[PDB]
Ligand binder design. Structure first.
Ligand SMILES: CCN1CCN(Cc2ccc(-c3cc4c(N[C@H](C)c5ccccc5)ncnc4[nH]3)cc2)CC1
Length: 302
C-alpha cells in the first residue's frame, strides 16, 4: 500500500473572514467566507464547516476523518480541502461552490435545464467517481445532495463523511445497493448503484426516490425486483443505463469508466437521448475589492 503524502495545511483564523451563514441545523454550520493566505495578495472564496459549537470528542474524530479523506483527493470533479483551522472546534475549509448542491439546483431550475447539461453532469460525476475508484475509495454516500455546483457547467462530488478504503470494514437507504442494506457490503459497485439513483434524481429534476415507501420496506421491494420508474424525459437508452446500475449481481453493473464513455457518447447528441420541452432555447459575488479574487482551482501549492 502506497504511503499517503498529502499535505494537511493548518490555517490561522486571522487568514480568513467569515461573511454569511449558508446552512445551519443538524451536524453544524457552513459559512461563505474569504481566505487570504499568509502574505500572498490573493483572496480565495471558501466554505468553512465549523461543526455546531458543543465540542464532543465524538464529532471531532468524525470531521478529522473527512479532513483526512478530502485532503487526499485531487481531481476536477472532486471537492478539495484547502486546510483545517484548529480554533476551539475544528473548522473545515474548502473551495466555495457558490451555486449550492445539485439537488437544490435542479429543483430550483427545472424550467431552464437542457439535455446538454444533464448529460454533462452525468459525465462529470462519473469521472469524479472513477477517480475515487482509482484511489481505491468507496464514497458510501453519493446522492445529488452531495454533488456541488461550481458553475452550472462544473460539478464536484463532496461529503466524504463515510468514505472508506476498499477492503476496509471500520444511513441513506434509498441510495443504497441491496448487498449494502442486507449485509453492509459496500464496493465501488455499490457506489455505482447510487450513481444510478443520483442520475434518476437529476432526470426527474429533483424527485425523492420511493416517495412514501418507508425505509423498512425498501430491501423487500428491491428483492421483489422493483426499481425506480423511467422518468418522463428519459429515452430508454438512458433509463437502461440506470437500470443496469441496479442489477442484483454487483459485478454485472457498469464500471464508472464505462459510464463516462456511454454518457459522453450521449452528450454528443443530447436531444437523441433526453426529450425536454423547450430544449433548443435554454440558457443558464460581493464587494468592490475583488481585484485579487482567485478561484481555488487556480490556486496551486508546491
Ligand atoms: C434555491 C437555492 N438556494 C439558494 C442558493 N444556495 C445557498 C447555498 C450556497 C452554497 C452552499 C455551499 C455549500 C458548500 C460546501 N459544503 C460542504 C459540505 C463542505 C465540506 C467541507 C468544508 C466546507 C463545506 N462546500 C463548498 N461549497 C459550498 N457551497 C450551500 C447553500 C442553495 C439554496
Amino acid at each position: 500500500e502506497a504511503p499517503n503524502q498529502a499535505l494537511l495545511r493548518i490555517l490561522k483564523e486571522t487568514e480568513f473572514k467569515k461573511i454569511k451563514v449558508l446552512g445551519s441545523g443538524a451536524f453544524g454550520t457552513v459559512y461563505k467566507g474569504l481566505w487570504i493566505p499568509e502574505g500572498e495578495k490573493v483572496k480565495i472564496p471558501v466554505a468553512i464547516k465549523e461543526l455546531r459549537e458543543a465540542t464532543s470528542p465524538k464529532a471531532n474524530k468524525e470531521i478529522l476523518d473527512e479532513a483526512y479523506v478530502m485532503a487526499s483527493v485531487d481531481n476536477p470533479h472532486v471537492c478539495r480541502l484547502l486546510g483545517i483551522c484548529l480554533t476551539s472546534t475544528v473548522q473545515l475549509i474548502t473551495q466555495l461552490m457558490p451555486f449550492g448542491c445539485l439537488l437544490d439546483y435542479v429543483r430550483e431550475h427545472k424550467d431552464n435545464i437542457g439535455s446538454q447539461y444533464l448529460l454533462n453532469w452525468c459525465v462529470q460525476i462519473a469521472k469524479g467517481m472513477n477517480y475515487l475508484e482509482d484511489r481505491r475509495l468507496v464514497h458510501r454516500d453519493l446522492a445529488a445532495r452531495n454533488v456541488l455546483v461550481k458553475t452550472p457547467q462544473h460539478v464536484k462530488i463532496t461529503d466524504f463523511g463515510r468514505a472508506k478504503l476498499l477492503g476496509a470494514e471500520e444511513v441513506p437507504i434509498k441510495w443504497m445497493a441491496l448487498e449494502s442494506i442486507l449485509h453492509r457490503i459496500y464496493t465501488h459497485q455499490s457506489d455505482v448503484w447510487s450513481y444510478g439513483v443520483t442520475v434518476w434524481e437529476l432526470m426527474t429534476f429533483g424527485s425523492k426516490p420511493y416517495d412514501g415507501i418507508p425505509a423498512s420496506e425498501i430491501s423487500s421491494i428491491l428483492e421483489k425486483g422493483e426499481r425506480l420508474p423511467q422518468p418522463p424525459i428519459c429515452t430508454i437508452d438512458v433509463y437502461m443505463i440506470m437500470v443496469k446500475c441496479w442489477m442484483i449481481d454487483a459485478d454485472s453493473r457498469p464500471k464508472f469508466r464505462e459510464l463516462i464513455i456511454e454518457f459522453s457518447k450521449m452528450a454528443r447528441d443530447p436531444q437523441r437521448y433526453l426529450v425536454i420541452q423547450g430544449d433548443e432555447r435554454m440558457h443558464l459575488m460581493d464587494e468592490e475589492d475583488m481585484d485579487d479574487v482567485v478561484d481555488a482551482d487556480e490556486y496551486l501549492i508546491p
